[PDB]
Short mmCIF file of C-alpha atoms and ligand atoms in Angstrom, two decimals:
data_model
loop_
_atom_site.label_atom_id
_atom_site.label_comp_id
_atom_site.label_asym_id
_atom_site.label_seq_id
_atom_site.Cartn_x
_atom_site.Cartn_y
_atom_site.Cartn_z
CA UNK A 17 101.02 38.77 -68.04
CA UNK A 18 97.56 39.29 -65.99
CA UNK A 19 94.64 39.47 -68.35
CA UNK A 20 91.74 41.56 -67.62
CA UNK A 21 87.99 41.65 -68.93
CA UNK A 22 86.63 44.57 -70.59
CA UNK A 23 85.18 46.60 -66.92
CA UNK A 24 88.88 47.85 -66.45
CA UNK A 25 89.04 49.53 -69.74
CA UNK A 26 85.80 51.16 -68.96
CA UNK A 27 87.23 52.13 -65.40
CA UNK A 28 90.18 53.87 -66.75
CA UNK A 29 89.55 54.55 -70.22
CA UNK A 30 92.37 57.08 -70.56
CA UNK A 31 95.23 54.44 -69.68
CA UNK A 32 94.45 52.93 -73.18
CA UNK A 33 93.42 55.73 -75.53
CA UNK A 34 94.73 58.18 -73.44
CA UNK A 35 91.50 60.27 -72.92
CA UNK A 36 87.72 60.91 -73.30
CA UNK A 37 87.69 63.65 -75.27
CA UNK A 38 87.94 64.06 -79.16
CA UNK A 39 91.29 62.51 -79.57
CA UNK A 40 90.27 59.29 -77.44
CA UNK A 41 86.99 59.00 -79.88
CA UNK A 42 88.96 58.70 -82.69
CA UNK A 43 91.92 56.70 -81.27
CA UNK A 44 89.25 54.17 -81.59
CA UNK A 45 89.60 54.25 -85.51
CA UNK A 46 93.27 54.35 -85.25
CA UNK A 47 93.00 50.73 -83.70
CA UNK A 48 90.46 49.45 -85.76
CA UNK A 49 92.25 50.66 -89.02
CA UNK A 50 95.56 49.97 -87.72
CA UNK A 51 95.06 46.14 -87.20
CA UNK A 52 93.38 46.49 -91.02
CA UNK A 53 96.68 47.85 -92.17
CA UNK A 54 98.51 45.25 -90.19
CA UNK A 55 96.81 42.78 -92.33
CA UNK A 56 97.68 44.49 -95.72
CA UNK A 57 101.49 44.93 -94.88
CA UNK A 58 101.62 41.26 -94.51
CA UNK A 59 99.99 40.89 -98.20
CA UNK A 60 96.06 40.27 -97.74
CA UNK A 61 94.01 42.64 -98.97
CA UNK A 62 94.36 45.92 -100.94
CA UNK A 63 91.73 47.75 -100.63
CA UNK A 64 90.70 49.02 -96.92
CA UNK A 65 86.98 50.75 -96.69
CA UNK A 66 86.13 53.34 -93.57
CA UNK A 67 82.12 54.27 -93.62
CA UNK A 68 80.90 57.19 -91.02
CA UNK A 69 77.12 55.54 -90.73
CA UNK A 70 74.15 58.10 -90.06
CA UNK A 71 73.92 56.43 -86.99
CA UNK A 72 76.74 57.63 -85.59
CA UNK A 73 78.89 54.45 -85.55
CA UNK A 74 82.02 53.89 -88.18
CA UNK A 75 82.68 50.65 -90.31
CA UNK A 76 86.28 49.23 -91.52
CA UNK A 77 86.41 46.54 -93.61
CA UNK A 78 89.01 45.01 -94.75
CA UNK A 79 89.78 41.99 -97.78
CA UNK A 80 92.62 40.45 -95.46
CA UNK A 81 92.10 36.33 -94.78
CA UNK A 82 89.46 37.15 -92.33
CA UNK A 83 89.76 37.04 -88.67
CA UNK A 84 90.06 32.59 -87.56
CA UNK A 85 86.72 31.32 -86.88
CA UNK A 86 87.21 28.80 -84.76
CA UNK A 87 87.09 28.27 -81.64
CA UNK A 88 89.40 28.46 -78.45
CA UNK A 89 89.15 26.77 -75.11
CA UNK A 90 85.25 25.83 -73.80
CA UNK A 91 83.60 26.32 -77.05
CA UNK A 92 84.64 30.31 -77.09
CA UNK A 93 84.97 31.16 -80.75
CA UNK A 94 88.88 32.56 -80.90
CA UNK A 95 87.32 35.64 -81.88
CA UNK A 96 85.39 36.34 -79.11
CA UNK A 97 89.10 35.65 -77.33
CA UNK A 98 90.18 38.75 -79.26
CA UNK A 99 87.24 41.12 -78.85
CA UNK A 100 86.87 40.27 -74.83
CA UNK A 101 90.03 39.86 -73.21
CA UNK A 102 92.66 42.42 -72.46
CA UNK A 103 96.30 41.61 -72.66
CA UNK A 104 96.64 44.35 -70.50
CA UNK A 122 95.16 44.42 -77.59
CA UNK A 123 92.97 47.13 -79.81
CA UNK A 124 89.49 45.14 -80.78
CA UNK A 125 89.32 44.18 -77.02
CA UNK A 126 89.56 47.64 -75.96
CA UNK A 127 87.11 49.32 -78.76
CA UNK A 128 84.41 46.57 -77.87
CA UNK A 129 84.81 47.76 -74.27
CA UNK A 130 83.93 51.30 -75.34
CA UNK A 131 81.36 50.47 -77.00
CA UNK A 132 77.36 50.75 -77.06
CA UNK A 133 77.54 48.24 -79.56
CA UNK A 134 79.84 46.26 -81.77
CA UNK A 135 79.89 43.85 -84.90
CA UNK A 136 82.37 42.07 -86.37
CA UNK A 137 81.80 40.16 -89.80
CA UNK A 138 84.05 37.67 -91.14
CA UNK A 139 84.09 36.13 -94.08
CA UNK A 140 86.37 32.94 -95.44
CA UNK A 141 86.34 29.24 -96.94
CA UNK A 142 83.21 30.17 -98.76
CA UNK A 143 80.87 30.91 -95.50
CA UNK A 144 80.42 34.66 -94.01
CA UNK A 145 80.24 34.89 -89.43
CA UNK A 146 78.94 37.37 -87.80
CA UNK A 147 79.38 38.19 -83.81
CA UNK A 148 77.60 40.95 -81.65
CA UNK A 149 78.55 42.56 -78.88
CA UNK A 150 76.60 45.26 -76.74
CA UNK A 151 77.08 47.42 -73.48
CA UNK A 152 80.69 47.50 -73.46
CA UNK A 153 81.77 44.26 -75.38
CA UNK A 154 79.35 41.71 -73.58
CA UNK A 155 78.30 38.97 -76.56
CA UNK A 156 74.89 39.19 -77.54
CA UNK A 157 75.03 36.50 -80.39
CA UNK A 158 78.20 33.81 -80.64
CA UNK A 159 80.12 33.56 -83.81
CA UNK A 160 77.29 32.68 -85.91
CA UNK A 161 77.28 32.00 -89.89
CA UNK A 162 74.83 34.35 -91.50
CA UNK A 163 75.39 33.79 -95.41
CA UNK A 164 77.75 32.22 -97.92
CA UNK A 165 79.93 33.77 -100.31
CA UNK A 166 82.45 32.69 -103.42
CA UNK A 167 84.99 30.41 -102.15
CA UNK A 168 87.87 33.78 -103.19
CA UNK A 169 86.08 36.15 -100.73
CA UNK A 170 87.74 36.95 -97.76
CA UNK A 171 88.40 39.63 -95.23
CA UNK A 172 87.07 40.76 -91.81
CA UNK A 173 84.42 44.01 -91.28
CA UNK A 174 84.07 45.59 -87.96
CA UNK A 175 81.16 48.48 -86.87
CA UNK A 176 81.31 50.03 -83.38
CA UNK A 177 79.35 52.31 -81.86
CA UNK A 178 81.39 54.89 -78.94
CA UNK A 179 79.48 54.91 -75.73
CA UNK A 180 77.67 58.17 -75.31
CA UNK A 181 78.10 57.58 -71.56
CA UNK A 182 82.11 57.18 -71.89
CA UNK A 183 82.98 59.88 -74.52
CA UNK A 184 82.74 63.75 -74.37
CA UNK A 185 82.04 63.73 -78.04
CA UNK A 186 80.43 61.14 -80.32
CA UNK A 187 81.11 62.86 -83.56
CA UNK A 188 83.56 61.61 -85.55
CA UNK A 189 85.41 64.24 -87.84
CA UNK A 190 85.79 63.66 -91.54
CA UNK A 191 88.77 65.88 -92.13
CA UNK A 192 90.74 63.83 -89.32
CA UNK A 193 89.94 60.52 -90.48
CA UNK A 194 90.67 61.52 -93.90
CA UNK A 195 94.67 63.03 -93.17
CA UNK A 196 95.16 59.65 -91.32
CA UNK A 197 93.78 57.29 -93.80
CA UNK A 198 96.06 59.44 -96.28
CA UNK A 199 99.16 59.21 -94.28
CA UNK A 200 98.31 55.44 -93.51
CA UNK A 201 97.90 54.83 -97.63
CA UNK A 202 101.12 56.73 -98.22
CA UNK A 203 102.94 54.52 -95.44
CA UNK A 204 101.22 51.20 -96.85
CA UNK A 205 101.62 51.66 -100.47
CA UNK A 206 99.79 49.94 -103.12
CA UNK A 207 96.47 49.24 -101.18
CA UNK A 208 93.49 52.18 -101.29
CA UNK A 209 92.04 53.42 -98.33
CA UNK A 210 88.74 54.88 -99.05
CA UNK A 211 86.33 57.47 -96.70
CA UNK A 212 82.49 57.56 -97.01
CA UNK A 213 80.92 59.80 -95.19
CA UNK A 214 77.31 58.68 -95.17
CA UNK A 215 75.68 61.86 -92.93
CA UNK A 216 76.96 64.24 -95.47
CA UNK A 217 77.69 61.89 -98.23
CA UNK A 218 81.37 62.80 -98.39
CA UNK A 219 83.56 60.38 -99.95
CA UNK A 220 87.42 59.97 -100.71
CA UNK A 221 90.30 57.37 -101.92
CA UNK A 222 94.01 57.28 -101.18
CA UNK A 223 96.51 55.21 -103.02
CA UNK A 224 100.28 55.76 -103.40
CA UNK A 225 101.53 53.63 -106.07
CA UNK A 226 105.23 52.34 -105.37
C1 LIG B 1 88.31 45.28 -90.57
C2 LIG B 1 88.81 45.90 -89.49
C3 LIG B 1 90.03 45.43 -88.78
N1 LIG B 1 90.81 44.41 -89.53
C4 LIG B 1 91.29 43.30 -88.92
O1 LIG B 1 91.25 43.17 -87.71
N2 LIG B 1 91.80 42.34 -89.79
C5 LIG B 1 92.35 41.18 -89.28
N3 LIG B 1 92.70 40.23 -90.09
C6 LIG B 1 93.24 39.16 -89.42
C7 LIG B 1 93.70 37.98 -89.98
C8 LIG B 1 94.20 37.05 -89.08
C9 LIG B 1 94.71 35.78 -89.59
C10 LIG B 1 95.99 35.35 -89.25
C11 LIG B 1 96.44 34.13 -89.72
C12 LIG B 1 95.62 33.37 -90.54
N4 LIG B 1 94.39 33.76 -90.92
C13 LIG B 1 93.99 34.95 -90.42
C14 LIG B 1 94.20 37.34 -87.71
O2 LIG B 1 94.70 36.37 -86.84
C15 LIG B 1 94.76 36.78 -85.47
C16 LIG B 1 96.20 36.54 -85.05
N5 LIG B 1 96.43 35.10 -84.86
C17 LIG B 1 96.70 34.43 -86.13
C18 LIG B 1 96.73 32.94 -85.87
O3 LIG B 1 97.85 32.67 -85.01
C19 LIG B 1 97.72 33.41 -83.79
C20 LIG B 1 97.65 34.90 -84.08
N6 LIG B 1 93.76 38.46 -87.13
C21 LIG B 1 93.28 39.34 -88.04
S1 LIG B 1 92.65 40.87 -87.59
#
């Protein structure tokens, strides 16, 4: 297994969401909400929450056990691990096609928050930014797509919507929910089994 650092997605975007274009843009979301998912099917968390932001970037939180917060070798938090290296493996390769990227996580009664800017390089470490109740958990994660990568920033409600729908449908029991903050759009999915 050779790992690589964030530079080769960004060399050859297309050998990991398979283009630039449209469908690439939004294979971003597909990780991001897949790994959300992930966490569900195993039992943590039923409710999943996608927000288009006026900015242009997209949020997914989720109410799983939150992403670890320690650390890994040389004082790296493990989540820094996950969001920078390539097992060339979907937060790595978001963050790398990014402008920008936060991920919040919140557990044992503390809420971390790490940045990331101009293609996944760490602005901030794992820092803890608040507290909450000792029963909240989950991980949040807000990227923005490069401009200088991707054909097309725009992310398309009606797209994100079918998927979220099929992804409910597939899940069962856990709402997936789509707000839409440039047009104020909103919608919910659950499939009760
Ligand atoms: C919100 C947008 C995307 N949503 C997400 O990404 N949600 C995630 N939730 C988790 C939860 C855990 C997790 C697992 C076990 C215990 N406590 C938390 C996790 O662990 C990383 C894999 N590790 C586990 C430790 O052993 C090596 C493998 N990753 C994620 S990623």
């Amino acid at each position: 297994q050779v790992l690589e650092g964030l530079d080769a997605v960004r060399k050859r975007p297309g050998m990991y969401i398979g283009s630039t274009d449209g469908a690439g843009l939004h294979h971003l979301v597909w990780e991001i909400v897949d790994n959300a998912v992930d966490e569900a099917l195993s039992g943590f968390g039923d409710r999943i929450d996608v927000t288009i932001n006026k900015d242009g970037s997209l949020t997914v939180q989720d109410h799983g056990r939150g992403m670890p917060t320690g650390m890994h070798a040389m004082g790296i938090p493990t989540v820094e691990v996950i969001f920078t290296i390539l097992h060339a493996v979907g937060s790595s390769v978001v963050n790398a096609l990014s402008s920008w990227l936060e991920v919040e996580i919140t557990r044992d009664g503390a809420v971390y928050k790490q940045r990331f800017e101009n293609g996944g390089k760490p602005v901030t470490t794992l820092k803890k930014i608040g507290t909450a109740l000792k029963s909240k958990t989950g991980t949040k994660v807000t990227f923005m797509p490069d401009a200088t990568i991707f054909s097309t920033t725009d992310f398309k409600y009606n797209t994100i919507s079918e998927r979220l729908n099929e992804s409910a449908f597939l899940l069962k029991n856990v709402t997936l929910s789509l707000t839409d903050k440039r047009t104020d759009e909103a919608i919910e999915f659950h499939y009760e089994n």
